Amino acid sequence: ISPIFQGGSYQLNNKSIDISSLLLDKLSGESQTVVMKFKADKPNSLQALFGLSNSKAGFKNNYFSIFMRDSGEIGVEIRDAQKGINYLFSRPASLWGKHKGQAVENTLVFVSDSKDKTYTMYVNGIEVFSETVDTFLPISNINGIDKATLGAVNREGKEHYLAKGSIDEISLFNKAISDQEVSTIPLSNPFQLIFQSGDSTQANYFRIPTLYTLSSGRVLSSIDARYGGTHDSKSKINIATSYSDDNGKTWSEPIFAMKFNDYEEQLVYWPRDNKLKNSQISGSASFIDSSIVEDKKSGKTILLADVMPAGIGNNNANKADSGFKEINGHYYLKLKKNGDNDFRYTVRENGVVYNETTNKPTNYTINDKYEVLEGGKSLTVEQYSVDFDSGSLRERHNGKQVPMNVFYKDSLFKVTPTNYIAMTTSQNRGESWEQFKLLPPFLGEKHNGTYLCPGQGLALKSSNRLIFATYTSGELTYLISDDSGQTWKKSSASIPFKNATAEAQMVELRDGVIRTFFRTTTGKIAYMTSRDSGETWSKVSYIDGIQQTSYGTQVSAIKYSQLIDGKEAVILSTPNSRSGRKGGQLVVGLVNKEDDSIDWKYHYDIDLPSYGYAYSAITELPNHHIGVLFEKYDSWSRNELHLSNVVQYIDLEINDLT
């Protein structure tokens, strides 16, 4: 249908624009849609973009408003004091401010549907909330409405929530437009989605993006496909991948690199209220924190990730246990059988489950997929599903039989409840992934596994050496392979931190010279250098000019292939803030050939200082553009949990950064 009101190019300069005589007598019926294209690159802390109010004395709480915060949050209020209704619906991190030095035109679509008693908000094509109420309040049915306002709400004759920004286009309809119709509305998005709600993964949430440019020109991405909201393990999380063959313009439908089937792949709207938001899937196995590298010699793509058994994460993982038994120099995965209080079993050669107490092989084997067989016959478990139908999280059997895996809750034989690292390989550059295999322990039998640094591995330019950074208490633990990931050795580098999340990413400054940039607990990004291809490592130094929070955030880093200002260049990606995970920047550093020092010469603001930016992935696209896939929200904030479609992709050129 045609709009009932359409207006454009309104400047919001801390002075409301009254549209009462154009709109108010045009509003009719109980369902309305607002379509608004607007910019706000210097917003006030809290500002109303659009308002319908009773502006009369004594009715200050009789209004409808579409508001935003300088955090990037969008929301609505629908209030009527007589009816006793005060709805507030909102979602953090819903907006863009700036891209490539220019204000972003956001496209907002708000549907107020009286038939379904539901209020739905879309920003930039993404549904940010959809709220069903038992008592519907039509937006123009508020008692005594007499003002329609842009850039404020008129309360008792005065301008409240004054806005700074502009509305290039605003339209209103006396209909609740359908989701199909919404999807036809043109967008001017500065970003794309690689992974997204409703795709092949059926995860409603994503975190921990990676990117890597392959020799074919294909660009590969991996990610945590997180099902139980945005929580770290314990949860249900799979590792998903997607690739682009056109310099990031389009991306393949995601597939899994690593997955468990003990719990169903469920698209769940995780509760965000203060009572229920900490609900965590507690009986599922999971993967977490992936990293990718390409091997020159074999042409294989290699992907590593942490593996967590059922119910396990960092918080409850058995410390002082690798989950392996050393027997004359060899490591064998330990197993506990149901009924036993101790781990009496190991997985020997050819998957033979061996009883250590009686020194006899059993009639059980573990196959390549870590599944339990008895006399060659595949054993099964019943899959679980999750729901909030009863008012709290429930995890229950769903009738479906799946192969019994030693990482599962219901398995007859169980692994040590601790963290592991696994690797998978692709021989077709991410079109399919081989079954993963656990990595052996590197710091001994009674030391739990190290934690993989998400992002990229390092493939040294002038050799066959592959390196994945990991971290543990007191050190970075580099995993080095010279034979296409068939065998790994460790290289330990002490850091002056106990129990820190020292997420580390590497660049090769010149042949065999590696600089590692890493997250710390000091509010500063740290670095160390190896001048012997990762064999030995320097003491720790810190970068000035970039701020992080006390808890820190992952930093991504690349060595750019082209000279900038006649010098070799390194690019870092990180939030630059001492307050939160916001103020994302790409920082361009020029290497001094005299001493390998770096002049951090250019700081490119991804978006506003106040808009969210957490974990990130950067890669040089084959055409020398920069691809950035990043968490566009504060992934630490307990106020910004369980947001959909916040991991976003952008394309930048060097001239944008400098």
Domains assigned to the chain: 1-190 (2.60.120.200), 191-319+418-658 (2.120.10.10), 320-417 (2.40.220.10)
Count the Cβ atoms, other than its own, within 10 Å of residue 430: 22
Residue-wise burial string across 485-508, b where 16 or more C-beta atoms lie within 10 A, e elsewhere: beebeebbbebebeebbbbbbbbb
Query: Which residues, including other chains, have CB under 8 Å from residue 390's CB and lie 6 or more apart?
Result: none
Residues sharing a CB contact under 8 Å with residue 54, sequence separation 6 or more, in sequence order? 62, 63, 142, 143, 144, 145, 146, 147
Residue 321's nearest CA partner among 352, 342, 291, 339 is 342
Torsion of CA 547, 583, 562, 302, to 10 degrees: 90
262 and 383 Cβ atoms separated by less than 8 Å = yes
Q: Which residues pair with 153 in a beta bridge?
A: 160
**Is 207 marked as binding a ligand?**
yes
Tell me, yes or no, if 615 is annotated catalytic: yes
Contact 504, 518 (CB under 8 A): yes
| Residue 300 preceded by cis peptide, ω within 30 | no
Q: Is 474 left (phi over 0), alpha (psi -120 to 50) or beta?
A: left
At a CB cut-off of 8 Å and minimum separation 6, what does 641 contact?
A: 229, 230, 231, 270, 272, 277
* Residue 348 assigned as binding residue: no
Which residues have CB under 8 Å from 256's CB, separation 6+?
201, 225, 238, 239, 240, 241, 433
**Cβ proximity of 532 and 513 under 8 Å:** no
Cβ-contact 459, 293 below 8 angstroms:
yes
Q: Exposed, middle or buried by CB within 10 Å (0-12, 13-18, 19+), for 84?
A: exposed
End-to-end CA separation in angstroms for the chain: 46
Yes or no: say if 419 and 442 are a contact pair by the CB < 8 Å rule. Answer: no
- Phi, then psi, of 261 in degrees rounded to 5: -115, 15
Residue 436: DSSP 8-state = P
Number of helices (H) and strands (E) in the chain: give both, helices first.
3, 52
Residue 358's CB is within 10 A of a number of other CB atoms, namely: 9
Helix (H) or strand (E) holding 657: helix 654-657
Distance, in Å, from the CA atom of 301 to the CA atom of 470, rounded to the nearest integer, reads 19
One of 232, 262, 640, 651 is an active-site residue; which one?
232
| Nearest Cα to Cα of residue 554 among 316, 322, 291, 378 | 291
Question: How deeply is 562 buried, as exposed, middle or buried, from its count of CB atoms within 10 A (0-12, 13-18, 19+)?
Answer: exposed
To the query of whether residue 232 is one of the catalytic residues in this protein, the response is: yes
Experimental method: X-ray
Choosing from 199, 503, 607, 651, which is the catalytic residue?
A: 503
Is residue 218 annotated as involved in ligand binding? no
Do residues 220 and 430 make contact, with C-beta atoms less than 8 angstroms apart?
Answer: yes
> Where does residue 370 rank: exposed (0-12), middle (13-18), buried (19+ CB within 10 A)?
buried
Say how many C-beta atoms besides its own lie within 10 A of residue 195's C-beta.
Answer: 26
The DSSP line for 274-320 is TTTTT----S--EEEEEEEEE-TTT--EEEEEEEE-TT--TTT--TT
Q: What is the enclosing helix (H) or strand (E) of 179?
A: helix 179-182
Catalytic member of 615, 620, 633, 651: 615
Catalytic annotation present for 321? no
